[PDB]
C-alpha cells in the first residue's frame, strides 16, 4: 500500500540501477491494460 506513493514519481528508480523499468512495464502491460492508463499510473509523458 505504501509503495503506491512512488509509482508516478519522476525519480522512482533512484538507487536501483534499472532506469527504464517504466518503459519496460509500459511495453509489457501497455496493450492489455491501456497505454494511457499505464502512463497515468507510472507518471510518464508519452508524447515527450
Amino acid at each position: 500500500q505504501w509503495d503506491r506513493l512512488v509509482l508516478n514519481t519522476p525519480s522512482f528508480p533512484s538507487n536501483y540501477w534499472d532506469k527504464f523499468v517504466k518503459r519496460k512495464v509500459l511495453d509489457k502491460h501497455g496493450d492489455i491494460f491501456g497505454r494511457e492508463r499505464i502512463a497515468e499510473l507510472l507518471g510518464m509523458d508519452l508524447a515527450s
Binding site: 496493450d31 492489455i32 491494460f33 491501456g34 492508463r37
Partner: protein, 145 residues
C-alpha cells in the same frame, strides 16, 4: 466438435501401453505432420477464441464499450482489437464475421466471447492431452515442437 473429441479419444486409445519412441507414437506424429495445415487451423481456432474471452474482459477493451447497453459497433470492435495488438488483420476480419453483428452493426461482446467456450472445452482438453502424451513419449522431435 463432439465428433472431433470422439476421434481424438480413438487416437489416445491407440497410444495405450505405448513406450518412449514407440512405433505408433512416431506414426501418429507423421500423420499430424502430414495434416500440418489443418492441425494448425484447428489450434488457431481454439487459440483465437480463448484469447477473445480474455480480451473482452480486459480493461483496455472496455474503454471502447461506451454504449449504455454494453454493445460495441463493428468499427469500434475493430479499433479495440487493433489496439490490443494480439490479432492479425485477417483474424480480426474473421472475428467480425463471427460476431453476429445486429442490423445496426452492434455486437454483444459478452455473448460473442462466451459462445464457443463450453462447446469447445472437451475437444480442446483432449487435444491438449494428445499433444502432451505425444510430446512426452517422443521427446526429440522438432515437428512436434
Amino acid at each position: 466438435l463432439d465428433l472431433q473429441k470422439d476421434m481424438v479419444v480413438m487416437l489416445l486409445s491407440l497410444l495405450e501401453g505405448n513406450v518412449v519412441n514407440g512405433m505408433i507414437a512416431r506414426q501418429m506424429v507423421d500423420m499430424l505432420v502430414e495434416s500440418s495445415s489443418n492441425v494448425e487451423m484447428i489450434l488457431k481456432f481454439f487459440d483465437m477464441f480463448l484469447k477473445l474471452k480474455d480480451i473482452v474482459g480486459s480493461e483496455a477493451f472496455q474503454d471502447y464499450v461506451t454504449d449504455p447497453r454494453g454493445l460495441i459497433s463493428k468499427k469500434d470492435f475493430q479499433k479495440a482489437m487493433d489496439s490490443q495488438k494480439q490479432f492479425t488483420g485477417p483474424e480480426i476480419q474473421f472475428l467480425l464475421s463471427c460476431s453476429e453483428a445486429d442490423e445496426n452493426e452492434m455486437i454483444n461482446c459478452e455473448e460473442f466471447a462466451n459462445r464457443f467456450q463450453e462447446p469447445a472445452r472437451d475437444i480442446g482438453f483432449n487435444v491438449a492431452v494428445l499433444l502432451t502424451n505425444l510430446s512426452e513419449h517422443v521427446p526429440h522431435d522438432p515437428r512436434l515442437r
